[PDB]
Design an enzyme around this catalytic site. Structure first.
Site, PDB file in Angstrom:
ATOM      1  N   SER A 200      -7.079  -4.020   0.884  1.00  0.00           N
ATOM      2  CA  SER A 200      -5.748  -3.443   0.987  1.00  0.00           C
ATOM      3  C   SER A 200      -5.438  -2.622  -0.280  1.00  0.00           C
ATOM      4  CB  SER A 200      -4.739  -4.547   1.276  1.00  0.00           C
ATOM      5  OG  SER A 200      -3.584  -4.023   1.881  1.00  0.00           O
ATOM      6  N   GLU A 325      -5.554  -4.013  12.359  1.00  0.00           N
ATOM      7  CA  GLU A 325      -4.957  -3.696  11.054  1.00  0.00           C
ATOM      8  C   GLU A 325      -3.430  -3.678  11.070  1.00  0.00           C
ATOM      9  OE1 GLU A 325      -6.273  -3.445   8.144  1.00  0.00           O
ATOM     10  OE2 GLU A 325      -8.416  -3.185   8.490  1.00  0.00           O
ATOM     11  N   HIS A 438      -4.909  -7.887   9.246  1.00  0.00           N
ATOM     12  CA  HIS A 438      -5.123  -7.387   7.889  1.00  0.00           C
ATOM     13  C   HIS A 438      -5.248  -8.557   6.909  1.00  0.00           C
ATOM     14  CE1 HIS A 438      -4.764  -4.014   5.085  1.00  0.00           C
ATOM     15  NE2 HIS A 438      -3.858  -4.669   4.385  1.00  0.00           N
TER      16      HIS A 438
HETATM   17  C1  LIG Z   1      -3.168  -7.848   1.732  1.00  0.00           C
HETATM   18  N1  LIG Z   1      -2.833  -9.274   1.854  1.00  0.00           N
HETATM   19  C2  LIG Z   1      -4.021  -9.996   2.324  1.00  0.00           C
HETATM   20  C3  LIG Z   1      -2.426  -9.797   0.544  1.00  0.00           C
HETATM   21  C4  LIG Z   1      -1.701  -9.450   2.774  1.00  0.00           C
HETATM   22  C5  LIG Z   1      -2.089  -9.183   4.227  1.00  0.00           C
HETATM   23  O1  LIG Z   1      -2.582 -10.374   4.854  1.00  0.00           O
END
Ligand SMILES: C[N+](C)(C)CCO
Ligand SMILES: *[C@@H]1O[C@H](CO[C@@H]2O[C@@H](C)[C@@H](O)[C@@H](O)[C@@H]2O)[C@@H](O)[C@H](O)[C@H]1NC(C)=O
Ligand SMILES: *[C@@H]1O[C@H](CO)[C@@H](O)[C@H](O)[C@H]1NC(C)=O
Ligand SMILES: *[C@@H]1O[C@H](CO)[C@@H](O)[C@H](O)[C@H]1NC(C)=O
Ligand SMILES: C[N+](C)(C)CCO
Ligand SMILES: C[N+](C)(C)CCO
Ligand SMILES: C[N+](C)(C)CCO
Lengths: 534, 538
Positions: A200, A325, A438
Site C-alpha cells: 500500500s 483491492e 487490500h
Molecule cells: C494497508 N493496510 C494493510 C495497513 C490497511 C489495509 O488492510
C-alpha cells in the site's frame, strides 16, 4: 550474556533477544534508534542521525508507534484492530528492527527491508503481521523494518519553506536505509544485496525511492505490493499540500511560513490529528490528507513524468495486486456498504458511490465510469453493482496504476515480475463479499501460517512457504523462480508485449496475460484524454 | 380475350391486367409484373410527390418487369457477381413507378396474408426486379401473396428544399406509401387480405419500413413489420432539414444551377438525369463510408420529429416487429473507402490504417469521440495485430451503423408496448463470392428468406435448402400471426420475444435455434449511451 545477542554498530553497543520461531531460534534487535527524536523544534523537519550512546543499548522490545490517528470504525473488531497501534504513541518514534538467524550468519546474507503501509497516516513496524522471525529462521534472511513519521508529522508541507519542506517521513525511511548500509554487516547482512518491500503506502514509498536518486545507491531490488508512486492518492502537488497545511493551521487556531509553522509546533500532537481528516477537498475514500508532495527536490517531477522518462536498466522489480483491492475502503464512507451484511446496493447507491470512489472525476468522467462498469445485461442487479463498486475503487487506485508502472518499468529496461494474489485466508474476519481484501497477502509472505497457534490450514502453511521462497529468491537473485528446482511452471518476466503475470493461490502457478488490459486502457489512456480536452 | 389462360386475367382499380404463369420448383405461380401505381414522375413531376396512376383502357400487359428507377450503377469490381447481383437488371428511367405481385396458381380462394418487400441500396439504388427478391418461392411453398414496388432513389427520390412546394423531400417514401395504398385497394383482386399486411425490407428498405411505423398516415396501411439490418434511427438513414438544404444547393451548383427555391428547382428539372447521378457523391460533408447523399429528411411532415424522438415517445402497443442483423454488418462497406481493404486479399491492416479507417467509418466523430472508439475496439493485449485490427474495423462500422441502432430500436419498441422478436443471422452462403474474411456480410441473408436455395440450378447445399425452408416458415408465420414460432410444432425450440428485461434473441444458422442474451450489450452502451453524452457536453 549471549555473545550472539551482542552487536556493535557505529553508534555503540546493542543487546538483542533470542526469540523462538517454530523451527528454531532467531536473534531480534528491536527498537534501535536511527535518528534524533523529531520532537519540539524538530517537528516537521528532516531527520538528523542518532548521536552515539554509551554502554549497551537495550534492543529487546519494540519502541513507540509514531503518533497517528487510531481507527474507530468497528471497535473491538480484529479485521480493523490488527492494523491499529500495538505500542504507545509518541512523536519519539524513529527506531528500526532487525531479525537475523541464530546463530548469526557466517557469510554476508541478503537483506529485506520492510516499509509498512497505512495511507501515509498510520502504521507501525511492530504489528504482528510484520513479524520477521519466520523469514529469518526458515529462509536465513536478515529482515529490517523501520518506523517512519506519518500524518502531519511525516508529510505536512509548506513547499519552499525551510521549516516544513515536506516528505520528511520519506527522509526517515531513507535514513533507515543509510543505517543499513553502514551497519548491517555487523549483523551478518550484505549491504550489497538489499531488497525493499512494502504494501500500500509502503509500496508507493518503495516506488518513490526508485524515483529519487539519492535513494538508489541504498538498495538493489524492489517489491511493490498493492501500491505505486504514480496514481491518484500517493502524491499531491505543492499547491494542494500548501492548501491543506494552511487549512489545518486555521482549524487549530494558528495564524509568513515561519510564524505559521512555529505555532503548529506548539500544539499537542492530538490537536493536529483531531483535524487531519477535515482538509480533504472532497467526500472520498482511498484519499489521505498528508502524503508525499511533488516538491522538486525528493521528487524532481511528478511520478508520472519520472516513470515515463526514467532509466531502470539495472533494476529488478516484483509488483502485484490482491483479488479485491477496492472492498476494504467501501465500508469507510460509501453508503450501503457494511461488514455486517452482504452490502447489496441499488443503482442509485452505485452512482453516488462512484462520486465518492472517484472524487476528482467530473460529471462526464463519472458517467463514463458508471457506463463502463455497469453490466448492461444486469444493470440493476445489486450483487453486480456491489462488485462493480469494489472494482471501480480497486482499479482506479491500485490495479491500473500498477499495470501502468509495470509497463513503463519494463519498457525502460527494468526486469519486472507481476502477480495477482487470490487466496482468501481461512481465518479472515471480514465478510465473504469483500473477497481477498487490500492487505491480506502480507500475513502469508511473512509466514505467519507456520505458527501452529494461529490456526491456519496445512495447505495455507505450504502456500506461505512457497511465497516466502518467491520473495527471498527474488531478494537473492532478482528472479523469484526456484533455481535448484526444475519443474515449475516458471514465473515469466512481465513485458509490454506479452503482459504475463501469475496467480498466487493454493494451486500451482498459472501464467495469465494482461492485467485488466481493456479496463486499464480506459483509466490510463482514455480518462486522461478526456481531462486534457475538458 | 378468349384464347388465353383464364387464370391470369385480373381487374384492378386502374383497369384490366394480364399476368404470366411462372415455374417454381414445386409448381406454378402467378406473376403480375410491372403494374403502374403512379403517373410517371417525369418532367415537371421530378422531385414532386407521386400522383396515383390514372386508369388505362384495354388489358395492360403485366408479364415482364418494368424500368428501374434512375440510379448510380456500381463499377468497383467489373464482372464480379458479388457486386453485380445488386445492379439494375432493366432499363434505367425516371418512369419507374411500377409494382409486382406474386401469388399461388391458381390464385387463392380465401384471403391470404400479404408480404410487402421494400428494397435497400442506401436510398441511392435498388430495384424490385432483382433475382434475390424473386417472390415465386414464398408464393409457391408458403402460399404467400408477395408485393414489391420500385420507389425513386437518389436525388429523384430524396433531394429536398425543405419548406418548398416543388421539392418537399421524402417523395421516395411517398412512392412506397402509394404502393401500400394500392395494396389496400386492389390486393383482394389477387386473393390477398388487406387486413393482414406485413412490410419487410433490408438495409435502406428496413429503415423505410421503420419510417412507415413512425409516420401516422402509413400506419393504417399495414399491421406488422420486419426490419433486416436497418433502422430509421441511426447515423445514416435521415438528415436534418438544414443538411438536406445544404446538399441540394451544393448539388444544384455543381450541375450549373446556382441559386428563391422555385428557380433553383426549375433549373434542376432541366438537367439530364445522368448529370444529377454524376455529381451525387460530391455533396457528402466528410470522406466516409455507410453514408448516402440523398436520404429521408426530418421535414416535420412525413417525419414529425427525429426518429430518435419518435421512438422514445411513441405508443407501439398494437405492433408486432421482427428485427435482426447479420454476423458481419460492416465488412461490405470497408472495400468502398477505407485504405487497406480489398476483396482480393486478406486486408490485414496496420494500426495507422485502423486509426485512419475509424475517421472514415465514424465520419461525424470529433477527435475525442474517435479516440474513444479506437480505445474501445483496440485489443490491448494485441494492439498492433493486423487480423484483429481488420476485424475491429469491420465491427466499428457494423456496430455504429446497424447493430447498435437495431439494439436501440428493439429496446425502445419493447419498452413502449410492441411485441418484438430479434435474430442474428450467421450462415455464410456456400456460393458466396466475397472473401472469407468478410464473413456473413450485409445483405447475404436475403437469398435465404426469399427461398432461392430451393432452386436446384443455383447449386446450394441440401442443408441450405432445409435452412431456407425454415426461414421462410419463420417469416410467413410472423406475417400470419405476429409470431414466428410454429403453433403445431414444439421443441423444435421456441423463439422468445425480445424484452428490455431479458434481451433475448436467436441465432439463425444451420443448427436449431439457440437463444442468446443481449445484443452487444456492453458495446452498444458505448454507442447508444456514452457517445451521445460526450456530444451533449462537448
Ligand atoms: C494497508 N493496510 C494493510 C495497513 C490497511 C489495509 O488492510
Ligand atoms: C490489399 O489490397 C489493397 C488494394 O489494392 C489492390 O490489391 C493490391 C494487392 C494491389 O495489387 C493493387 O493493384 C489493388 O488495387 C491494398 O491497398 C492493400 O495494401 C493490400 N493488402 C495487403 C497487405 O497486401
Ligand atoms: C447494511 O446493509 C443494509 C441493507 O442491506 C444497509 O441499508 C445498511 O446501511 C448497512 N449497514 C448497517 C447500517 O448496518
Ligand atoms: C452450378 O453447377 C453446375 C454443375 O457443376 C455448373 O456447371 C453451373 O454453371 C453452376 N451454376 C451456378 C448457378 O453457379
Ligand atoms: C477514513 N479513513 C481515511 C480514516 C480511513 C481510510 O481507510
Ligand atoms: C457509395 N459508393 C461507394 C457505392 C459509390 C461512391 O462513389
Ligand atoms: C444493401 N444491399 C443488399 C442492397 C447491398 C448489399 O448489402
Amino acid at each position: 550474556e549471549d555473545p550472539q545477542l551482542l552487536v556493535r554498530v557505529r553508534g555503540g553497543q546493542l543487546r538483542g533477544i533470542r526469540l523462538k520461531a517454530p523451527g528454531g531460534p532467531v536473534s531480534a534487535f528491536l527498537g534501535i534508534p536511527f535518528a534524533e527524536p523529531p520532537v519540539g523544534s524538530r517537528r516537521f523537519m528532516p531527520p538528523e542521525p542518532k548521536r552515539p550512546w554509551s554502554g549497551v543499548l537495550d534492543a529487546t522490545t519494540f519502541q513507540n508507534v509514531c503518533y497517528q490517528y487510531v481507527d474507530t470504525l468497528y471497535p473491538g473488531f480484529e479485521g480493523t484492530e490488527m492494523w491499529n497501534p500495538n505500542r504507545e504513541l509518541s512523536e519519539d518514534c524513529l527506531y528500526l528492527n532487525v531479525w537475523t538467524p541464530y546463530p548469526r550468519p557466517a557469510s554476508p546474507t541478503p537483506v529485506l527491508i520492510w516499509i509498512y503501509g497505512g495511507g501515509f497516516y498510520s502504521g507501525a513496524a511492530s504489528l504482528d503481521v510484520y513479524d520477521g522471525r519466520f523469514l529469518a529462521q526458515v529462509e536465513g534472511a536478515v529482515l529490517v523494518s523501520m518506523n517512519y513519521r506519518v500524518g502531519t508529522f511525516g508529510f505536512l508541507a509548506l513547499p519552499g519553506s525551510r521549516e516544513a519542506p515536506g516528505n520528511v517521513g520519506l527522509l526517515d525511511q531513507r535514513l533507515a536505509l543509510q543505517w543499513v548500509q553502514e551497519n548491517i554487516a555487523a549483523f551478518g547482512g550484505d549491504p550489497m544485496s538489499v531488497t525493499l518491500f512494502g504494501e500500500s503506502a509502503g509500496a508507493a514509498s518503495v516506488g518513490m525511492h526508485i524515483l529519487s536518486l539519492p535513494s538508489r545507491s541504498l538498495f538493489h531490488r524492489a517489491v511493490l505490493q498493492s501500491g505505486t508512486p504514480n496514481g491518484p492518492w500517493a502524491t499531491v502537488s505543492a499547491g494542494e499540500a500548501r492548501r491543506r497545511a494552511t487549512l489545518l493551521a486555521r482549524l487549530v487556531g494558528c495564524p509568513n511560513d515561519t510564524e505559521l509553522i512555529a505555532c503548529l509546533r506548539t500544539r499537542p500532537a492530538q490537536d493536529l490529528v483531531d483535524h487531519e481528516w477535515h482538509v480533504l477537498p472532497q467526500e472520498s475514500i482511498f484519499r489521505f490528507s498528508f502524503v508525499p508532495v511533488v516538491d522538486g527536490d525528493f521528487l524532481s517531477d511528478t511520478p508520472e513524468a519520472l516513470i515515463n522518462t526514467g532509466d531502470f536498466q539495472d533494476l529488478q522489480v516484483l509488483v502485484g495486486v490482491v483479488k479485491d483491492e477496492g472492498s476494504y475502503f467501501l465500508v469507510y464512507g460509501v453508503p450501503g456498504f457494511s461488514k455486517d451484511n452482504e452490502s447489496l446496493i441499488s443503482r442509485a447507491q452505485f452512482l453516488a458511490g462512484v462520486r465518492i470512489g472517484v472524487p476528482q472525476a467530473s460529471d462526464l468522467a463519472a458517467e463514463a465510469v458508471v457506463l463502463h462498469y455497469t453490466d448492461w445485461l444486469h444493470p440493476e442487479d445489486p450483487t453486480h453493482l456491489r462488485d462493480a463498486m469494489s472494482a471501480v475503487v480497486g482499479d482506479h487506485n491500485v490495479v491500473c496504476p500498477v499495470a501502468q508502472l509495470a509497463g513503463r518499468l519494463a519498457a525502460q529496461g527494468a526486469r519486472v515480475y507481476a502477480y495477482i494474489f487470490e487466496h482468501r485466508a481461512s481465518t479472515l474476519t471480514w465478510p465473504l463479499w469483500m473477497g481477498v481484501p487490500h492487505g491480506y497477502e502480507i500475513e502469508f509472505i511473512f509466514g505467519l501460517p507456520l505458527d501452529p497457534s494461529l490456526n491456519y490450514t496445512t495447505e495455507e502453511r505450504i502456500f506461505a512457504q512457497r511465497l516466502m521462497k518467491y520473495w527471498t529468491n527474488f531478494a537473492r537473485t532478482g528472479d523469484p523462480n526456484d533455481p535448484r528446482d526444475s519443474k515449475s511452471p516458471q514465473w515469466p518476466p512481465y513485458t509490454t508485449a506479452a503482459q504475463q503475470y501469475v496467480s498466487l493461490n493454493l494451486k500451482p502457478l498459472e501464467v495469465r496475460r494482461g492485467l485488466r488490459a481493456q479496463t486499464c486502457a480506459f483509466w490510463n489512456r482514455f480518462l486522461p484524454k478526456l481531462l486534457s480536452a475538458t
